[PDB]
Design a protein around this motif. Structure first.
Motif, PDB file in Angstrom:
ATOM      1  N   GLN A  81       0.853  -1.165   0.000  1.00 25.29           N
ATOM      2  CA  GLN A  81       0.000   0.000   0.000  1.00 25.29           C
ATOM      3  C   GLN A  81       0.918   1.253   0.000  1.00 25.29           C
ATOM      4  OE1 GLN A  81      -3.090   0.729  -1.072  1.00 25.29           O
ATOM      5  NE2 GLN A  81      -3.643  -1.221  -0.100  1.00 25.29           N
ATOM      6  N   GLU A  82       0.408   2.367  -0.508  1.00 26.82           N
ATOM      7  CA  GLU A  82       1.162   3.602  -0.428  1.00 26.82           C
ATOM      8  C   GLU A  82       1.342   4.017   1.038  1.00 26.82           C
ATOM      9  OE1 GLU A  82       0.391   7.705  -2.667  1.00 26.82           O
ATOM     10  OE2 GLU A  82       1.746   6.296  -3.693  1.00 26.82           O
ATOM     11  N   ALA A  83       0.374   3.695   1.889  1.00 24.48           N
ATOM     12  CA  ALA A  83       0.529   3.894   3.336  1.00 24.48           C
ATOM     13  C   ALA A  83       0.471   2.558   4.038  1.00 24.48           C
ATOM     14  CB  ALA A  83      -0.544   4.849   3.899  1.00 24.48           C
ATOM     15  N   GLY A  84       1.558   1.808   3.909  1.00 16.81           N
ATOM     16  CA  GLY A  84       1.655   0.508   4.531  1.00 16.81           C
ATOM     17  C   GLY A  84       2.943  -0.205   4.174  1.00 16.81           C
ATOM     18  N   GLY A  85       3.042  -1.445   4.638  1.00 15.27           N
ATOM     19  CA  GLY A  85       4.197  -2.284   4.381  1.00 15.27           C
ATOM     20  C   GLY A  85       3.815  -3.592   3.743  1.00 15.27           C
ATOM     21  N   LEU A  86       4.612  -4.610   4.037  1.00 16.61           N
ATOM     22  CA  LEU A  86       4.589  -5.873   3.353  1.00 16.61           C
ATOM     23  C   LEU A  86       3.548  -6.778   3.952  1.00 16.61           C
ATOM     24  CD1 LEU A  86       8.393  -6.766   2.693  1.00 16.61           C
ATOM     25  CD2 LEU A  86       6.692  -6.041   0.996  1.00 16.61           C
ATOM     26  N   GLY A  87       3.135  -6.515   5.172  1.00 21.73           N
ATOM     27  CA  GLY A  87       2.123  -7.332   5.789  1.00 21.73           C
ATOM     28  C   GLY A  87       2.644  -8.683   6.213  1.00 21.73           C
ATOM     29  N   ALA A 109      -0.651  -7.050   2.097  1.00 21.11           N
ATOM     30  CA  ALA A 109       0.023  -7.112   0.830  1.00 21.11           C
ATOM     31  C   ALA A 109       0.607  -8.475   0.496  1.00 21.11           C
ATOM     32  CB  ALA A 109       1.121  -5.979   0.732  1.00 21.11           C
ATOM     33  N   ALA A 110       1.361  -9.074   1.412  1.00 20.10           N
ATOM     34  CA  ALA A 110       1.999 -10.371   1.141  1.00 20.10           C
ATOM     35  C   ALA A 110       0.931 -11.441   0.993  1.00 20.10           C
ATOM     36  CB  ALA A 110       2.952 -10.764   2.273  1.00 20.10           C
ATOM     37  N   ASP A 111      -0.112 -11.359   1.810  1.00 20.74           N
ATOM     38  CA  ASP A 111      -1.211 -12.307   1.707  1.00 20.74           C
ATOM     39  C   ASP A 111      -1.905 -12.200   0.340  1.00 20.74           C
ATOM     40  OD1 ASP A 111      -2.834 -14.415   2.908  1.00 20.74           O
ATOM     41  OD2 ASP A 111      -4.460 -12.945   3.042  1.00 20.74           O
ATOM     42  N   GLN A 112      -2.068 -10.985  -0.178  1.00 20.76           N
ATOM     43  CA  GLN A 112      -2.684 -10.793  -1.495  1.00 20.76           C
ATOM     44  C   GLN A 112      -1.864 -11.335  -2.643  1.00 20.76           C
ATOM     45  OE1 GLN A 112      -5.817  -9.584  -1.984  1.00 20.76           O
ATOM     46  NE2 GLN A 112      -6.160  -8.961   0.142  1.00 20.76           N
ATOM     47  N   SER A 113      -0.558 -11.480  -2.472  1.00 21.15           N
ATOM     48  CA  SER A 113       0.258 -12.101  -3.506  1.00 21.15           C
ATOM     49  C   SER A 113      -0.074 -13.581  -3.672  1.00 21.15           C
ATOM     50  CB  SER A 113       1.756 -11.999  -3.176  1.00 21.15           C
ATOM     51  OG  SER A 113       2.128 -12.914  -2.128  1.00 21.15           O
ATOM     52  N   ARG A 114      -0.587 -14.224  -2.613  1.00 22.32           N
ATOM     53  CA  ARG A 114      -0.929 -15.670  -2.605  1.00 22.32           C
ATOM     54  C   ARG A 114       0.267 -16.539  -2.964  1.00 22.32           C
ATOM     55  NH1 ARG A 114      -5.090 -13.694  -0.301  1.00 22.32           N
ATOM     56  NH2 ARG A 114      -7.141 -13.855  -1.335  1.00 22.32           N
ATOM     57  N   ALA A 115       1.473 -16.037  -2.744  1.00 18.86           N
ATOM     58  CA  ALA A 115       2.677 -16.718  -3.190  1.00 18.86           C
ATOM     59  C   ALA A 115       3.704 -16.927  -2.072  1.00 18.86           C
ATOM     60  CB  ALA A 115       3.327 -15.916  -4.298  1.00 18.86           C
ATOM     61  N   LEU A 116       3.432 -16.422  -0.901  1.00 21.20           N
ATOM     62  CA  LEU A 116       4.404 -16.582   0.237  1.00 21.20           C
ATOM     63  C   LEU A 116       3.886 -17.561   1.245  1.00 21.20           C
ATOM     64  CD1 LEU A 116       5.323 -12.890   0.625  1.00 21.20           C
ATOM     65  CD2 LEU A 116       6.837 -14.695   0.003  1.00 21.20           C
ATOM     66  N   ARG A 117       4.776 -18.094   2.070  1.00 24.26           N
ATOM     67  CA  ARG A 117       4.418 -19.117   3.014  1.00 24.26           C
ATOM     68  C   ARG A 117       5.108 -18.772   4.319  1.00 24.26           C
ATOM     69  NH1 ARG A 117       6.795 -24.237  -0.521  1.00 24.26           N
ATOM     70  NH2 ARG A 117       6.246 -23.233  -2.499  1.00 24.26           N
ATOM     71  N   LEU A 118       4.409 -18.992   5.414  1.00 25.53           N
ATOM     72  CA  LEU A 118       5.040 -19.076   6.730  1.00 25.53           C
ATOM     73  C   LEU A 118       6.236 -20.008   6.646  1.00 25.53           C
ATOM     74  CD1 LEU A 118       2.186 -19.256   9.324  1.00 25.53           C
ATOM     75  CD2 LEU A 118       4.447 -18.315   9.752  1.00 25.53           C
ATOM     76  N   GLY A 119       7.406 -19.495   7.029  1.00 26.96           N
ATOM     77  CA  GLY A 119       8.591 -20.311   7.094  1.00 26.96           C
ATOM     78  C   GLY A 119       9.464 -20.237   5.864  1.00 26.96           C
ATOM     79  N   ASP A 120       9.103 -19.373   4.906  1.00 29.64           N
ATOM     80  CA  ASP A 120       9.922 -19.096   3.740  1.00 29.64           C
ATOM     81  C   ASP A 120      11.080 -18.253   4.241  1.00 29.64           C
ATOM     82  OD1 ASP A 120       8.596 -20.199   1.436  1.00 29.64           O
ATOM     83  OD2 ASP A 120       7.407 -18.377   1.172  1.00 29.64           O
TER      84      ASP A 120
END
Length: 95
Positions: free
Chosen positions: A12-18, A41-52
């Motif tokens: 987000q313009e006013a936010g971070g990576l989440g 933001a990271a959740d919206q990518s649908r491409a990251l995982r806990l523990g990456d």
């Protein structure tokens, strides 16, 4: 020895990576994603995982970063980030 994945996150313009991260060179620990906040933001990518493991961000290498150096690098990488990540399969063995 998991494959590397190159993952785009747009802040987000006013936010971070989440996400939250833990780890760092000061303890010979890699930088790892310890939380992905729902719907950010990271959740919206649908491409990251806990523990990456986060290995790099926009050309900045984090494989030997201290915790604070990783935090700064990610915070200053801009509004769109390409993250190089590798999932860490944790095995816990009873001994």
């Amino acid at each position: 020895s998991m494959p590397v994945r190159r993952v785009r996150v747009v802040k987000q313009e006013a936010g971070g990576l989440g996400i939250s991260i833990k780890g760092g060179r000061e303890n010979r620990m890699p930088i790892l994603i310890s939380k992905i906040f729902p719907g950010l933001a990271a959740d919206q990518s649908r491409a990251l995982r806990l523990g990456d493991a986060i290995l790099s961000v926009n050309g900045t290498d984090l494989r030997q970063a201290t915790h604070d150096q990783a935090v700064q690098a990610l915070k200053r990488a801009g509004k769109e980030v390409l993250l190089e990540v590798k999932f860490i399969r944790e095995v816990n063995t009873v001994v």
